[PDB]
Design a protein around this nucleic acid. Structure first.
Ligand SMILES: [Mg+2]
Ligand SMILES: [Mg+2]
Ligand SMILES: [Mg+2]
Ligand SMILES: [Mg+2]
Ligand SMILES: [Mg+2]
Ligand SMILES: [Mg+2]
Ligand SMILES: [Mg+2]
Ligand SMILES: [Mg+2]
Ligand SMILES: [Mg+2]
Ligand SMILES: [Mg+2]
Ligand SMILES: [O]
Ligand SMILES: [O]
Ligand SMILES: [O]
Ligand SMILES: [O]
Lengths: 89, 275, 44
RNA sequence: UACCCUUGGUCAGGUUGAAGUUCAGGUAACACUGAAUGGAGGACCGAACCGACUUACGUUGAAAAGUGAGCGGAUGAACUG
RNA sequence: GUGAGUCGCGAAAGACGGGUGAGAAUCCCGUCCACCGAUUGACUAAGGUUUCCAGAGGAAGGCUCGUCCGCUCUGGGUUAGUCGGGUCCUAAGCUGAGGCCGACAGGCGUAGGCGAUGGAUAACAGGUUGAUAUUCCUGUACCACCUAUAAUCGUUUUAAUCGAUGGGGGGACGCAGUAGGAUAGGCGAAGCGUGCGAUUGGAUUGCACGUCUAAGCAGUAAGGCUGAGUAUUAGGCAAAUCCGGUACUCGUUAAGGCUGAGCUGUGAUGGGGAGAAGACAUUGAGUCUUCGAGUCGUUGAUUUCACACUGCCGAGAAAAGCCUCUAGAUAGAAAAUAGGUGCCCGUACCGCAAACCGACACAGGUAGUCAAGAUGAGAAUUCUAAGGUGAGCGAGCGAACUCUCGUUAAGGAACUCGGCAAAAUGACCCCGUAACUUCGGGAGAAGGGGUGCUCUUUAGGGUUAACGCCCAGAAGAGCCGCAGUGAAUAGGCCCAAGCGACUGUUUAUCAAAAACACAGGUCUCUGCUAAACCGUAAGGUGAUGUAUAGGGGCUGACGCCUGCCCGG
């Protein structure tokens, strides 16, 4: 379902330029094919073609209390549009 | 024949090698071939058992019908070819039926000569047929010891056996190695010496030409240190101290007999001359 | 010089890896000690 | 690191000029002759690459075995991923 | 703590100005200078794992200082139907149902299966960010597939038509050598833009630029067809119109029949690219809307593009894709058209290095691709483009002493264990070149000579319609300086002897040799699941081998030779 396929949004200067050609940037739950995102984001907003591109990221390090630990895995997915547009801000 | 090579430098002086006058084509039939990795003289395991092999050049398997199994059907011979893995040069054979099979080359074979595999195939060179029917006083190659296997005998370069005579069952034969054996009456064989005769006058000429084959070096025993070989050790050079010159594994070489006298064919063996 | 340990993955996620160990008696025993002793890593 | 296997990659430039071929020469016919062709060699110089011969240096060192000047092999039993 | 504020501060060319800041030889900016340039350059693999970029900070780290960093803190960055890989194949090898063996463990091994450094496989150019690019957009392309639509099929036979899990073809491979056809880039010009010097002089005079894809239509330089076509079939396990064979008509006619292929022409591209201040309200007027405007001809030419051809022999992976043949499936397709559908991994950065291995920000190693200019045979050498760097302590003085380089009259190995080292020779051409010899060589023997720029005259060869463009000789005549391959890179030689025949390998980190091996010789073993061997045994090597073959010992090219003793 949409819920466990879209975990977060993302915003930044990168996405800000991205919204010129009607692009967007979400972060998903991991272990999700590219295609489920298409049909599911379609299911939830009725926006569509301009198919998806996607990446991963390896987890960095961090020290907040002088103990070692890693950040969390991050699979980022870049959505782009041809059919209207969506704003939820 | 063997063509001496003019000395131009040190590593050719005694050199010698073949002329290749019994060849018609160079590139083989794709079909009968079959591939061949190498092992360098060592086991399913990986350990070295036989010494000094490997290092050589790549090659393939040219299949042979040593059985000459299909009988009666006349054949012809439209080509010769070369065979690395044996001294004996090799022939290709268009059977009557369109089949194609390679056979070791008898000396004095003519391309276009025809050769048979049958009982009623009267005697010439090449023809394949049993021992019982053959006359006495004849030279024969590629005998089988057993019906239907594929021959094991006189299969290398040069001449071949002699038939001295026959009972009904079994049948005599004298080899080269000059040694005698009773053979079955019905084993399939053929007639005529083998091809290449001057494979042995080859002065290999230079060290590499053993590696090209390939084989590789063998080190003496009176050089090593005494663990690795019994003769070894010794200040300076090394006379062999002990009697009975030994292998690396004990077990002498020089005169000792290793035929195991319980083997069943020891009755078939008479008049042991060469060994 | 080229010193020992010119490193690589495949020869190290092979031999000292898991499925070798847990595809051999002795290796299973090895793992038993690296569990009984407590460790944060195996196959390394 | 040592061997071995399967599979790939590499080796500037130049010099020498065998077998054989062929043109005439020449014999009864072959041997043999002189040219032109042809381009073999664990062939010759010599950079990459490899190696470690002599020497100096360093020798709580730049380095737990190298550097600089020279040195040998470099189409082969070569080198190496 | 002592040693000691002592050794060291890890090859190297920096200087000045202007800013900043509390504070600067070390930070930013610029100008100059110097360095590499078959590279200290550019691109990727292995490898490491966020080191990448922005904004702040300077407690410790940095071998100094530090306002800075590859250190800290916060935030942020890696986009694929076509790229490397998987949904395709396979060798070596690994695992291996049943199974054979073993005291247990477990060991062997068929079927099959995994496993690439190889085989097949649909994409290109530009633009763009502080940080991503064949991934984004911009344009132009391709493959498979589904859906929709019709010009051909007609027992579901055979025919259009699908087609193997089986049969066949090809895929499919060595090494060396020469020659050739094409382009890459380079070259010097009479086409384009800018600009005329303040040092005597010069004005066709100086400087820079000289392109455009993959894809689709045509052709195409060189090669190939032991050939084309028919009929039959003792075979390719069953079948076969396919293969293979066999007999004939046409063959060497090359007609060019068929095949494959460098690359070229055209469009793609009235487009992108671009030397371009001659462009502003403007941005620091740098800058941007903005218009500027060119594709010519020559010569040179690979180490790139066909293991193609020839030669040699040491006789040169496999399977799949791909194309066919039937057994068979099955009513009966789809030409070219429109539309859509197209997964996972990786992608940042360094990658002859500060980030990899080396405990260090270490003078080491670290496969592969590109590799320009003059000089040169040349990837050699010297100096420079492209571009990158100034090496993470410096300022003084200019003593010993050590090290590294240069020189030294007279003599010239007297030093010395020993001419160790250092110096001398060194390139091209010409003359010439002994002994001995296994006739190949020795032999670059030795020794000896010439080489610069200008002017004149002349041979020439390749390339062209020709012009001129290139290439490298001879002859004379002159000029200069001590010196003409003016610097740099590049053999020291002769005679005699022992040992070894070679060339080769060896004691990784004290020995590279007269040792080891080597082709050859010789003796003995071994009649074939042969001997020997690893193992407990199966099993496997030997060996796709079959006594002109395989194992063991000894000796070491050549040629002269290989004596006596069989008691131990
Ligand atoms: Mg050399
Ligand atoms: Mg200053
Ligand atoms: Mg083949
Ligand atoms: Mg050929
Ligand atoms: Mg990686
Ligand atoms: Mg380094
Ligand atoms: Mg150059
Ligand atoms: Mg003198
Ligand atoms: Mg003297
Ligand atoms: Mg021998
Ligand atoms: O050489
Ligand atoms: O050399
Ligand atoms: O050499
Ligand atoms: O050489």
């Amino acid at each position: 379902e949409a819920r466990d396929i879209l975990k977060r949004p993302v915003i930044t200067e990168k996405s800000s330029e991205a919204m010129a050609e009607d692009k967007y940037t979400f972060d998903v739950d991991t272990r999700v094919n590219k295609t489920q995102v298409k049909m599911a984001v379609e299911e939830i907003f009725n926006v569509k073609v301009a198919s998806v591109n996607i990446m991963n990221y390896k987890p960095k390090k961090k020290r907040m209390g002088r103990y070692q630990g890693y950040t969390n895995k991050r699979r980022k997915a870049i959505v782009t549009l041809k059919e209207g547009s969506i704003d939820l801000f | 024949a063997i063509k001496k090579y003019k000395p131009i430098t040190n590593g050719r002086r005694n050199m010698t090698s073949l002329d290749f006058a019994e060849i018609t084509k160079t590139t083989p039939e794709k079909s009968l071939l079959k591939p061949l990795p190498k092992k360098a003289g060592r086991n399913n395991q990986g350990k070295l058992t036989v010494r000094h092999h490997g290092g050589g050049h790549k090659r393939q398997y040219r299949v042979i019908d040593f059985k000459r199994n299909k009988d009666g059907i006349n054949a012809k011979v439209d080509s010769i070819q070369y065979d690395p893995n044996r001294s004996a040069n090799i022939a290709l054979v268009v059977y009557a039926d369109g089949e194609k099979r390679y056979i070791i080359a008898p000396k004095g074979l003519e391309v276009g000569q025809i050769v048979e595999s049958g009982a009623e195939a009267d005697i010439k060179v090449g023809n394949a047929l049993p021992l019982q029917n053959i006359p006495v006083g004849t030279v024969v190659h590629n005998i089988e010891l057993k019906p239907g296997k594929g021959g094991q005998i006189a299969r290398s370069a040069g001449a071949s056996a002699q038939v001295l005579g026959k009972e009904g069952k079994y049948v005599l034969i004298r080899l080269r190695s000059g040694e005698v054996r009773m053979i079955l009456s019905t084993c399939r064989a053929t007639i005529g010496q083998v091809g290449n005769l001057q494979h042995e006058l080859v002065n290999v000429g230079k060290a590499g030409r053993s590696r090209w084959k390939g084989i590789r070096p063998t080190v003496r025993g009176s050089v090593m240190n005494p663990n690795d070989h019994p003769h070894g050790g010794g200040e300076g050079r090394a006379p062999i101290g002990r009697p009975s010159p030994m292998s690396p594994w004990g077990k002498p070489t020089l005169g000792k007999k290793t035929r195991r006298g319980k083997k069943s064919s020891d009755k078939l063996i008479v008049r042991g001359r060469k060994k | 010089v080229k010193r020992t340990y010119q490193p690589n993955k495949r020869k190290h996620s092979k031999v000292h890896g898991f499925r070798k160990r847990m595809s051999t008696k002795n290796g299973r025993k090895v793992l038993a000690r690296r569990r009984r002793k407590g460790r944060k890593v195996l196959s390394a």
